[PDB]
Amino acid sequence: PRXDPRXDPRXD
Ligand code: NA
């Protein structure tokens, strides 16, 4: 989720 983690931060 690096960067903007809004929404669904699953994964990176
Ligand atoms: Na995401």
Side-chain angles (χ1 to χ4, degrees):
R2 72 186 76 201
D4 192 310
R6 83 181 72 190
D8 194 319
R10 288 177 282 191
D12 191 322

Coordinates of all heavy atoms in Angstrom, one line a residue:
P1 N 0.8 -1.2 0.0 CA 0.0 0.0 0.0 C 0.8 1.3 0.0 O 0.3 2.3 0.3 CB -0.8 -0.1 1.3 CG 0.1 -0.8 2.2 CD 0.8 -1.8 1.3
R2 N 2.1 1.2 -0.3 CA 2.9 2.4 -0.3 C 2.3 3.5 -1.3 O 1.7 3.1 -2.3 CB 4.4 2.1 -0.6 CG 4.7 1.8 -2.0 CD 6.1 1.4 -2.2 NE 6.4 0.0 -1.7 CZ 7.5 -0.5 -1.3 NH1 8.6 0.3 -1.1 NH2 7.6 -1.8 -1.0
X3 N 2.5 4.7 -0.9 CA 2.0 5.8 -1.6 C 0.8 6.3 -0.9 O 0.8 6.6 0.3 CB 3.0 7.0 -1.8
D4 N -0.4 6.4 -1.6 CA -1.6 6.8 -0.9 C -2.4 5.6 -0.6 O -2.8 4.8 -1.5 CB -2.4 7.7 -1.9 CG -3.6 8.4 -1.2 OD1 -4.3 7.7 -0.5 OD2 -3.7 9.6 -1.3
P5 N -2.5 5.2 0.7 CA -3.1 4.0 1.1 C -4.6 4.0 1.2 O -5.2 3.0 1.7 CB -2.5 3.8 2.5 CG -2.5 5.2 3.1 CD -2.1 6.1 1.9
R6 N -5.3 5.0 0.8 CA -6.7 5.0 0.9 C -7.3 3.9 0.0 O -6.7 3.5 -1.0 CB -7.3 6.4 0.5 CG -7.5 6.6 -1.0 CD -8.1 8.0 -1.3 NE -7.1 9.0 -1.0 CZ -7.3 10.3 -1.0 NH1 -8.5 10.8 -1.2 NH2 -6.2 11.1 -0.8
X7 N -8.5 3.5 0.4 CA -9.2 2.5 -0.4 C -9.0 1.1 0.3 O -9.3 0.9 1.5 CB -10.7 2.8 -0.4
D8 N -8.4 0.2 -0.5 CA -8.2 -1.1 0.0 C -6.7 -1.3 0.0 O -6.1 -1.6 -1.0 CB -8.9 -2.2 -0.8 CG -8.9 -3.5 -0.1 OD1 -7.8 -3.9 0.5 OD2 -10.0 -4.2 -0.1
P9 N -6.0 -1.2 1.2 CA -4.5 -1.2 1.2 C -3.9 -2.6 1.2 O -2.7 -2.7 1.4 CB -4.2 -0.5 2.5 CG -5.3 -0.9 3.4 CD -6.6 -0.9 2.5
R10 N -4.7 -3.6 0.9 CA -4.1 -5.0 0.8 C -3.1 -5.0 -0.3 O -3.3 -4.4 -1.4 CB -5.2 -6.0 0.8 CG -5.8 -6.1 2.2 CD -6.9 -7.1 2.3 NE -8.1 -6.5 1.8 CZ -9.2 -7.1 1.9 NH1 -9.3 -8.2 2.6 NH2 -10.3 -6.5 1.5
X11 N -2.1 -5.8 -0.1 CA -1.0 -6.0 -1.0 C 0.2 -5.1 -0.6 O 0.6 -5.2 0.5 CB -0.5 -7.4 -1.1
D12 N 0.6 -4.1 -1.5 CA 1.7 -3.2 -1.1 C 1.1 -1.8 -1.2 O 0.8 -1.3 -2.2 CB 2.8 -3.4 -2.1 CG 4.0 -2.6 -1.7 OD1 3.9 -1.5 -1.1 OD2 5.2 -3.1 -1.9
Ligands
NA1 NA -4.8 -0.4 -2.4

